[PDB]
Structure formats: C-alpha cells, structure tokens
Amino acid sequence: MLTAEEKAAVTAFWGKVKVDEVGGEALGRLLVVYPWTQRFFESFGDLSTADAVMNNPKVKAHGKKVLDSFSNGMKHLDDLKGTFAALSELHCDKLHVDPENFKLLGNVLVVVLARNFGKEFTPVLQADFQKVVAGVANALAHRYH
Amino acid sequence: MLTAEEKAAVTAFWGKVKVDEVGGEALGRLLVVYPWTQRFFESFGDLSTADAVMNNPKVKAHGKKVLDSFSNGMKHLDDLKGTFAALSELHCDKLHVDPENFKLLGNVLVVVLARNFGKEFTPVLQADFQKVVAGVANALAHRYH
Amino acid sequence: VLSAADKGNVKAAWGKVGGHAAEYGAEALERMFLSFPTTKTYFPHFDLSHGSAQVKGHGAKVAAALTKAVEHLDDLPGALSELSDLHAHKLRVDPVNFKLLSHSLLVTLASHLPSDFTPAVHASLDKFLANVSTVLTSKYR
Amino acid sequence: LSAADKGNVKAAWGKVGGHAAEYGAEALERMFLSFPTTKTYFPHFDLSHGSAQVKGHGAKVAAALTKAVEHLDDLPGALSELSDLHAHKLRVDPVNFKLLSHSLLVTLASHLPSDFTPAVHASLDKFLANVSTVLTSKYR
Ligand SMILES: *[C@H]1CC(=O)N(CCCCC(=O)NCCOCCOCCO[C@H]2O[C@H](CO)[C@@H](O[C@H]3O[C@H](CO)[C@H](O)[C@@H](O)[C@@H]3O)[C@H](O)[C@@H]2O)C1=O
Ligand code: HEM
Ligand code: HEM
Ligand code: HEM
Ligand code: HEM
Numbered sequence: 386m387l388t389a390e391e392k393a394a395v396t397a398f399w400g401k402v403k404v405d406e407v408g409g410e411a412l413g414r415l416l417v418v419y420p421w422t423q424r425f426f427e428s429f430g431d432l433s434t435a436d437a438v439m440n441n442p443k444v445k446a447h448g449k450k451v452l453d454s455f456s457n458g459m460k461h462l463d464d465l466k467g468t469f470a471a472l473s474e475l476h477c478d479k480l481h482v483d484p485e486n487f488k489l490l491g492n493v494l495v496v497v498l499a500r501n502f503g504k505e506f507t508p509v510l511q512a513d514f515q516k517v518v519a520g521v522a523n524a525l526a527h528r529y530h
Numbered sequence: 531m532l533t534a535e536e537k538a539a540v541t542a543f544w545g546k547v548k549v550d551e552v553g554g555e556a557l558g559r560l561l562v563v564y565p566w567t568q569r570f571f572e573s574f575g576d577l578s579t580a581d582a583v584m585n586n587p588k589v590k591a592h593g594k595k596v597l598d599s600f601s602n603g604m605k606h607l608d609d610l611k612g613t614f615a616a617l618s619e620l621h622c623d624k625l626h627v628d629p630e631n632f633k634l635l636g637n638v639l640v641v642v643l644a645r646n647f648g649k650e651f652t653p654v655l656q657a658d659f660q661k662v663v664a665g666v667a668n669a670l671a672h673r674y675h
Numbered sequence: 676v677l678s679a680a681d682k683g684n685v686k687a688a689w690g691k692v693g694g695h696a697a698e699y700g701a702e703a704l705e706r707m708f709l710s711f712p713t714t715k716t717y718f719p720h721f722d723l724s725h726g727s728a729q730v731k732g733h734g735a736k737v738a739a740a741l742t743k744a745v746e747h748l749d750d751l752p753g754a755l756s757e758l759s760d761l762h763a764h765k766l767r768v769d770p771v772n773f774k775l776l777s778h779s780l781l782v783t784l785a786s787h788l789p790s791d792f793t794p795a796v797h798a799s800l801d802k803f804l805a806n807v808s809t810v811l812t813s814k815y816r
Numbered sequence: 817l818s819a820a821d822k823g824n825v826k827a828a829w830g831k832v833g834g835h836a837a838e839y840g841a842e843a844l845e846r847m848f849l850s851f852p853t854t855k856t857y858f859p860h861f862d863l864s865h866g867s868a869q870v871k872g873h874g875a876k877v878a879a880a881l882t883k884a885v886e887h888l889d890d891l892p893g894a895l896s897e898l899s900d901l902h903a904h905k906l907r908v909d910p911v912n913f914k915l916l917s918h919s920l921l922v923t924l925a926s927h928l929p930s931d932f933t934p935a936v937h938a939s940l941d942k943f944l945a946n947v948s949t950v951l952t953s954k955y956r
C-alpha cells in the first residue's frame with residue numbers, strides 16, 4: 386500500500402473530485418467498453434446503445450453509490466481488506482462477479498479521472514492511484530484469494 | 531480448502547503419480563503452449579522448437595523440483611499460504627513472474643494428469659484438483675494480493 | 676492469429692476426434708459444471724444432474740459448431756456470425772467462462788487422445804479455441 | 817471489430833494527428849512509472865525523467881500504430897515484422913501489452929477529452945487488444 390507522501394497527495398487530489406458526476410461515467414463506460422458486464426444490470430432498464438447507457442437513471446444513480454464506497458475506502462487506506470469486507474461477500478455469494486472484472490473498473494475509474502482533469506492528473510499522480518484501485522481490487526477478491 | 535471427503539481421493543490419486551515423468555511434461559508444455567514463459571529460462575539452452583523444449587535436460591530436472599514442492603503442498607493443504615511463503619516471495623521479488631501465469635501452470639498440470647491417467651482421472655476427481663491448483667496458485671500470488 | 680502449422684495441427688487433431696465429437700462435447704460441459712460451479716448460472720433451465728440427457732443433446736451442438744470452425748479457419752467471423760449474436764449480444768457471456776470451457780475441453784481431448792495430444796498440438800488448439808472465444812465475445816455486427 | 821469501431825479508431829487517431837509522437841512518449845513514461853516491472857524489458861534504455869531515448873522511442877511506436885490504423889483489415893500482414901520481434905525474439909508477457917493498452921488510453925483521455933467518447937473509448941480498447949493479439953502471436 387501507499388506511504389506517507391503518496392497518501393497525502395492522493396487525498397489532496399480526491400477532494401477536487403465530484404462524486405456524483407464521476408460515478409455515472411465510470412459505470413456507464415464499464416458497460417459500454419466491456420459489454421459482457423451488462424448482464425449483471427438487466428434490471429436497470431435499457432442498455433441497447435451507448436447513449437441509452439450513459440443516460441440511464443438507474444445506472445447513474447448506482448454509480449454514485451460505488452464512488453461513495455470508494456471515497457470511504459480512501460479514508461481507510463491502512464486497511465482496505467476490512468473496509469471492503471462486506472461488499473466482497475456480496476459480489477461472490479449473491480452476484481458471482483468474477484474477480485477479474487474489478488481490475489477493469491479500477492482502470493475505467495482512472496481513465497475517467499484523467500479525462501476530467503487532463504494534465505492536472507500528472508503521470509506520477511496516476512501511478513499513485515494505480516496502487517489504490519489495485520489495492521481495492523484485491524480487497525473485493527479476498528473471498529477468491 | 532477441501533472438505534474431509536475431498537482430501538482422501540486427491541491424495542490417494544497423487545500417490546499413483548510419477549513425479550519425474552509428469553513434472554518434466556507439465557513444464558515442457560508450459561514453454562510450448564505459452565511461449566512467453568521461455569523468457570524466464572534464457573540460461574536453460576535451446577528452446578527453439580517443440581522437440582527441443584521437451585528434450586531439454588535442465589527443463590526435465592527442474593520439472594521434478596516443481597512437482598516435489600507441489601507434492602509438499604499436498605500434505606500441508608490447509609496451510610498452503612505458510613508452506614509457499616518462501617516460493618511466493620522469490621517468484622515476484624526476484625523473478626518478476628506475473629501472478630496470472632501461476633494459474634496457467636496449475637491448468638497445464640491437470641491436462642498432463644488427464645493425459646497420463648485417462649479415465650482414471652474422472653470429472654469429479656478433476657474438480658477436487660482444480661481447487662488444489664487454484665489454492666497453490668493463490669498461495670504463490672500472496673505477496674501481490 | 677494461427678500459423679499454417681497451427682491450422683494443420685488443428686485439422687489433423689479433429690480428424691482423429693471423428694464421430695466422438697458429441698461424446699467429448701458432452702463430457703466437456705459435464706466437467707465444466709462440476710469443476711467450476713459458477714458456470715451453472717447460465718443454465719438455470721437445464722437439467723444438470725450427473726448423466727443428463729439434455730447436456731448430452733447440447734454437447735453435440737457445441738461440437739457440431741467447432742467442426743464448422745475447423746472447415747473455415749480462414750474465416751472464423753463469417754462462419755460464426757450467428758453464434759456471436761447469441762453468446763455476446765443476447766446471453767452476454769463473460770469471456771472468463773470461455774477460458775474455463777476451453778480448459779475443460781482440452782482436458783477431455785487429452786484423456787482420450789494421449790497418443791495424439793502432443794505439446795505441438797496443445798499450443799495450436801489453445802490458440803484455436805481462444806480465437807473462437809474472441810469471436811463469440813465480440814460485437815461486430 | 818465492427819464497422820463503427822473501424823470508423824471510430826480512424827477518427828480518433830486523426831484527431832491525434834501530428835501529436836502522436838509526444839503521446840507515444842507519454843504513454844511510455846506513464847507505464848514505466850505506474851508498473852515498474854515493465855522497466856525490466858528495457859535494461860539498456862535510459863529510463864530517466866524525460867529521456868532522449870524514451871521520447872525518441874515513443875515516436876517509433878506511434879508511427880507503427882498509425883500504420884496499424886491504416887491497415888485495419890490486414891493487421892497480421894502489416895505487423896508481421898513487429899511480431900517477429902515482440903513474439904519470437906523478446907518473448908513479452910501479454911499482460912504488459914494490456915498495461916500499455918491501458919497506459920495509452922489514459923494519455924488519449926487527458927489530452928483529448930472532448931473526443932474521448934464512450935463509443936470511441938470502447939473502439940480504441942478493442943483495436944489495441946486486436947493489435948496486441950497480433951504482436952503476441954507466432955504465425956511467422
Ligand atoms: C464466495 C466464495 C466463497 O468461498 N464464499 C464463502 C461462503 C461459501 C459459499 C458456499 O457456502 N457455497 C455453497 C453453494 O452455495 C450455497 C449458498 O448458500 C445457500 C443460500 O444462498 C443461495 O440463495 C439464493 C436465493 O435463494 C440462491 O439464488 C437463486 O437465484 C439466483 C437468481 O439469479 C441464482 O440464479 C440461483 O443460484 C438460485 O436459484 C443462490 O443459490 C444462493 O447461493 C463465498 O461467498
Ligand atoms: C471496484 C469494484 C466494485 C465496487 C467497490 C463495487 C461496489 C458496489 C456497491 C457499493 C454496491 C451497492 C451495494 C448494495 O447496496 O447492495 C454494488 C452492487 C452491485 N454490484 Fe458492484 N462494485 C464493484 C464492481 C462490480 C463489478 C465489476 C460488477 C460486475 C459487472 C458489479 C456488479 C454489481 C451488481 C450486479 C450489484 C447489485 C445491483 C443492484 O441490486 O442494484 N460490481 N457494488
Ligand atoms: C504452479 C505454480 C508454480 C510452482 C509450484 C513453482 C515452483 C517452483 C519451484 C519449486 C522452483 C525451484 C526453486 C528452488 O529450487 O528453490 C521454481 C523456480 C522458478 N520459477 Fe516457479 N513455480 C510456479 C510457477 C512459475 C511460473 C509459471 C513461472 C514462469 C515461467 C515461474 C518462474 C520460475 C523461475 C524463473 C524459477 C527459477 C529457475 C531456476 O533458476 O532454477 N514459476 N518454481
Ligand atoms: C468454445 C466456445 C463456445 C461454443 C463453440 C459454443 C457453442 C454453443 C452452441 C452451438 C449453442 C447452441 C445454440 C442453440 O442452437 O440454442 C450454445 C448455446 C449456449 N451457450 Fe455456448 N458455446 C461456447 C461457449 C460458451 C460458454 C463458455 C458459455 C458459458 C458457460 C456459453 C453459454 C451458452 C448458453 C447460456 C446457451 C443457450 C442454451 C440454450 O440453448 O438454451 N457458451 N453455445
Ligand atoms: C501494441 C503495442 C506495441 C507496439 C505498437 C510496439 C511497437 C514497437 C516498435 C515500433 C518498436 C521499435 C522497433 C525498432 O527497434 O525499430 C518496439 C520495440 C520494443 N518493444 Fe514494443 N510494441 C508494443 C508493445 C510492447 C510492450 C507492451 C512492451 C513491454 C514493455 C514492448 C517491448 C519492446 C522492447 C523491449 C523493444 C526493443 C527496444 C529497442 O531495443 O530499441 N513492446 N516496439
């Protein structure tokens with residue numbers, strides 16, 4: 386996991402992030418870029434075109450929730466295994482989400498951050514977030530590990 | 531990992547396994563089927579064709595060393611993480627092997643085991659072994675996750 | 676992408692499988708459901724009890740589909756266009772399952788053909804199935 | 817790859833235009849900083865901050881990518897010489913390709929935010945994946 390210097394700057398940047406707006410885009414792009422993930426969200430309504438996906442109210446409302454779990458895990462970087470312990474058990478027994486798909490969403494989130502911040506999301510600032518989204522990725526797969 | 535019933539048939543079958551013949555075949559195929567694995571054994575000599583890879587003497591001798599540590603993990607089934615902490619650290623901190631490649635070798639082993647035993651290695655007996663290899667692979671990928 | 680050598684190996688291997696395609700097709704799934712329980716979730720309507728008649732009737736479908744792919748190795752997309760309509764756009768099957776089936780299939784072919792399942796063929800079929808898998812997972816219509 | 821995919825990748829790489837050289841250099845620096853185990857494929861390289869080598873090398877990649885974009889229908893044929901290197905000689909682990917794929921898709925996101933639509937994102941990812949598969953295949 387992160388050190389002191391890595392941790393302090395990862396917190397600083399996250400403050401400027403708009404939880405509402407980033408969550409919907411990430412989950413949307415996950416369903417658009419990796420379209421086999423759409424089966425898990427059949428109940429969400431219409432998923433035919435990428436425009437219908439990126440404007441789906443249930444999708445966007447749920448993306449906000451996943452980012453709230455991400456914001457919470459950002460405050461508990463010393464222990465991600467215990468923070469994401471609950472959701473980990475949810476994705477296995479109730480959802481059967483393959484642990485590989487967490488890597489893709491962590492990566493999507495990073496791309497989503499980069500688009501909305503351009504150069505301000507420095508190559509070093511990216512690498513530090515690559516430890517976070519991978520640190521989270523392992524915590525949701527701890528039932529499979 | 532396994533239940534009490536799933537420990538008995540997995541061990542009884544393992545005693546019938548020739549640790550030299552299978553060891554030099556599983557690693558052989560790992561370097562043929564997955565050619566990028568040859569990068570880790572530059573010192574090993576000629577690995578140009580399927581014939582050379584299979585009849586390389588260092589390949590076969592190193593092949594048993596793997597299956598012996600695999601045979602070692604057959605006894606310590608509950609404490610695989612503890613038994614493989616030495617080999618999990620070595621393969622990433624020195625040899626930089628990607629944790630995904632571990633999954634492939636446990637896969638190749640089953641294929642070779644099915645080839646060497648045929649019908650004696652049943653769908654049910656395979657299922658018990660698929661967990662074993664998936665436990666040893668996860669124990670060897672412990673320094674990452 | 677396959678070599679001419681990869682395509683020769685595949686064509687020869689299936690020439691040895693012959694009429695037992697349905698037998699191994701059925702055995703492949705039988706192995707998949709048992710080895711990896713999660714793959715049963717795509718089949719809630721199926722009978723999955725050991726030795727099911729439905730699985731044996733369905734295994735023959737898979738093997739009948741793979742035998743077409745062998746005949747048209749230079750055009751996997753065109754030959755398997757209707758199967759991408761189902762597995763990708765309709766059923767929306769996770770690509771990680773395709774790795775599990777192919778592994779369960781490769782084990783099946785190894786047990787029955789230990790004389791013909793050489794490492795040289797092993798690599799070629801591994802590439803072959805991962806090319807069929809890529810087609811069935813991609814939306815290209 | 818669909819008909820819209822081919823169109824999207826062309827339009828995206830067209831928006832990249834003459835900038836590709838710098839983006840090939842960034843896509844690298846972003847990989848060598850984020851995934852330090854990839855730095856082992858380049859031991860002879862000078863991997864310092866803003867290298868003359870890395871910058872010059874990133875120019876070779878993007879140029880070869882441009883060739884791939886212009887040869888969307890026959891990628892195995894066009895990239896036959898690059899496969900010789902990456903697959904037969906270098907013996908690169910496929911996960912590194914996926915890591916360059918993700919690193920490059922970051923560079924294109926930050927630099928071109930108006931153009932990096934979900935539609936185009938999915939197309940470029942599907943293109944790089946198909947290019948990666950060519951380069952990690954020994955078809956000789
Ligand atoms: C994941 C990995 C892991 O190691 N753990 C720890 C716990 C071990 C998991 C376990 O005990 N597995 C045995 C097999 O699963 C049985 C689970 O216990 C039974 C209660 O859960 C089941 O109830 C629901 C609701 O009745 C079932 O869902 C039905 O409907 C859905 C609809 O999509 C499914 O399609 C069907 O499976 C089912 O008809 C489901 O069977 C639940 O498992 C991990 O947690
Ligand atoms: C970065 C990793 C992920 C995190 C942190 C995460 C987090 C969450 C959260 C917070 C919820 C809501 C919990 C609830 O109130 O029930 C949830 C539910 C859910 N997640 Fe995930 N998720 C992740 C990845 C995935 C992936 C990859 C998939 C599969 C494509 C997935 C599929 C689902 C589904 C189907 C639900 C329930 C939908 C519903 O009932 O509305 N998740 N997840
Ligand atoms: C099933 C998973 C694996 C097991 C059980 C395993 C086991 C072993 C063992 C027992 C050794 C000998 C170490 C010693 O003598 O102290 C070894 C060495 C080594 N392994 Fe692994 N291994 C696995 C996966 C892999 C894979 C897939 C690779 C990549 C090809 C790899 C790369 C290496 C390398 C480069 C060495 C050193 C070779 C030498 O100098 O002798 N390991 N492994
Ligand atoms: C080697 C790759 C595969 C091939 C060649 C293949 C082939 C087929 C064929 C021929 C059918 C029959 C379609 C019909 O006429 O009804 C089918 C159906 C189906 N397959 Fe696959 N398949 C492959 C991989 C998978 C995987 C990995 C899964 C997930 C476990 C899957 C899930 C399904 C489902 C849910 C059906 C519909 C069952 C029904 O007919 O009601 N496929 N497949
Ligand atoms: C699909 C993406 C890739 C493309 C388009 C690509 C293309 C190229 C090109 C154009 C060169 C220069 C060839 C020359 O020397 O004239 C090269 C060299 C090289 N590439 Fe890649 N490559 C890709 C993926 C990768 C990845 C992911 C790695 C691992 C980090 C890698 C490792 C290398 C190495 C070690 C060299 C030799 C450098 C030298 O000696 O100058 N390649 N590649």
Ligand SMILES: [O]
Pocket residue numbers: 447451
């Ligand atoms: O989610």
Ligand SMILES: [O]
Pocket residue numbers: 596
């Ligand atoms: O090894």
Ligand SMILES: [O]
Pocket residue numbers: 737
């Ligand atoms: O299937």
Ligand SMILES: [O]
Pocket residue numbers: 877
């Ligand atoms: O490269």
